[PDB]
Amino acid sequence: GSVSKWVRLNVGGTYFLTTRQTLCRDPKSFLYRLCQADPDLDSDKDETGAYLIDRDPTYFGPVLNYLRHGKLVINKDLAEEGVLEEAEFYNITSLIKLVKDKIRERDSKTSQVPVKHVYRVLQCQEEELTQMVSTMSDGWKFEQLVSIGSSYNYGNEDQAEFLCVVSKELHNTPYGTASEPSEKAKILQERGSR
Amino acid sequence: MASNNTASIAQARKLVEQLKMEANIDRIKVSKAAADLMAYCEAHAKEDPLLTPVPASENPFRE
């Protein structure tokens, strides 16, 4: 009444009751400016005094959740884009900093169509080959085995007898290649390369 | 802060502390330390496989 501790609010014609501090959590939200009692913003119901906000109640929910606990949680049906622009209306940088990251994650995962598989050439004896394949590290997929004509021990019973090419899926598009300048790293790279 | 050369004073403080403990650390005589090293070596030079030859049927490379 005389003071507003838990304010009832109208977001797209829906009742939302929450304490001011949940909304006053950060100093950038448009809702923060709403919390401030001044004649400039006077728009509320004549029944209960809930402020009339012409924004989406469904996309307002994740924003209120973030303001309550600094984490934006979006249900598995609401587009992250819609909440993105809803927050843009509510003008919260740090939150937006996370919505854009989530969107980039989604776009990179969808851009994993040309996924970057990391390929390795393990080499094993025919004898050790059975265990090697059986013991082949979890997370890596077998791709090809190739026998070769060896010169030592005839063309068999050789360490180079079998070349078991394997690979592993890497979501590099979300990950991003980890390339950066390290002077001694560059020196080592050039020395090994030649 | 930049006014203190990015507060690089802390690096000088840490270096000074390192030198301080170096000073505090006593310096056991160089000849004494060398003698200790030979003492241990000869205490173990009579069993070092690379020094003392291993029996041909004892090293795990002819068995």
Binding site: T19, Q21, C24, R25, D26, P27, R68, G70 | -
Partner: protein, 263 residues
């Protein structure tokens, strides 16, 4: 990270509410408010500093309100005042831990530290109870009442039981807190009193009446133990009776006047 401003803006009113509860004002603030305040305060990875702030704020409340008053009321039912103060602290800190169940739940286990109530009781035991002028006043007055009852007086048995249970529960690691402050002084004064009583009655009365008297004193020790002391104290003290009265004076009991063993 760059979150200090509102961190302080919530911390200040959190500590104001903590003091109000410790000042016993539960008519201007609500439980869930401070509950969420403490929770979010945790959520910024500020658990350690709130742990410390609780520690020092309650330390302050105890030293500047509890210890001082206890020292003020040494000559007026000092035990009653100390017990009431302990109870008020226990209530206050109970709903304080209700507020901050989270750091109690997540921070405490994360840091492998004492829980929030462990801290509250530790600080109460140290800064008021084990506090010298209070600890020793309590121990000496306890021995005073228990001896006077032993002399044959009727004293506040409930208050003595109160003292025993303070020391019990404020014993965090175990009975050690109970042991040192009162249990050891009590057992020692009981042992010396039993020694003097055994010698006096051996010299004065017959062997049979001596057995009757020591048996009645064993019964009175049980009376003391379950009316003003802790149960775990029962076994030491009765063993002390066995040693002071009986074990140390076995063969002397054999022959006495016309009512020794042979008689």
């Amino acid at each position: 990270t760059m979150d200090e401003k509102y961190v302080n803006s919530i911390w200040d009113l959190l500590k104001n509410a903590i003091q109000e509860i410790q000042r016993k004002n539960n008519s201007g603030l609500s439980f869930e408010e401070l509950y969420r305040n403490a929770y979010t305060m945790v959520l910024h990875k500020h658990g350690e500093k709130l742990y410390t702030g609780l520690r020092e704020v309650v330390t302050e409340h105890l030293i500047n309100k509890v210890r001082e008053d206890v020292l003020n009321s040494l000559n007026n039912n000092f035990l009653q005042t100390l017990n009431q103060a302990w109870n008020d602290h226990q209530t206050a800190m109970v709903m304080i831990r209700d507020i901050l169940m989270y750091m109690d739940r997540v921070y405490v286990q994360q840091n492998n530290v004492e829980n929030v109530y462990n801290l509250g009781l530790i600080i109460f035991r140290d800064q008021v109870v084990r506090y010298g002028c209070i600890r020793d006043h309590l121990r000496q007055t306890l021995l005073d009442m228990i001896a006077r009852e032993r002399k044959g007086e009727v004293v506040d048995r409930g208050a003595i039981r109160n003292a025993c249970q303070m020391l019990m529960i404020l014993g965090l690691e175990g009975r050690s807190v109970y042991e040192e402050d009162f249990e050891a002084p009590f057992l020692e004064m009981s042992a010396e009193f039993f020694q003097m009583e055994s010698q006096k009655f051996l010299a004065e009365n017959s062997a049979s009446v001596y057995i009757k008297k020591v048996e009645a004193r064993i019964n009175e020790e049980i009376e003391r133990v379950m009316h003003c002391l802790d149960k775990s104290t029962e076994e030491p003290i009765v063993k002390v009776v066995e040693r002071e009265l009986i074990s140390k004076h076995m063969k002397t009991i054999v022959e006495m006047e016309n009512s020794g063993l042979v008689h």
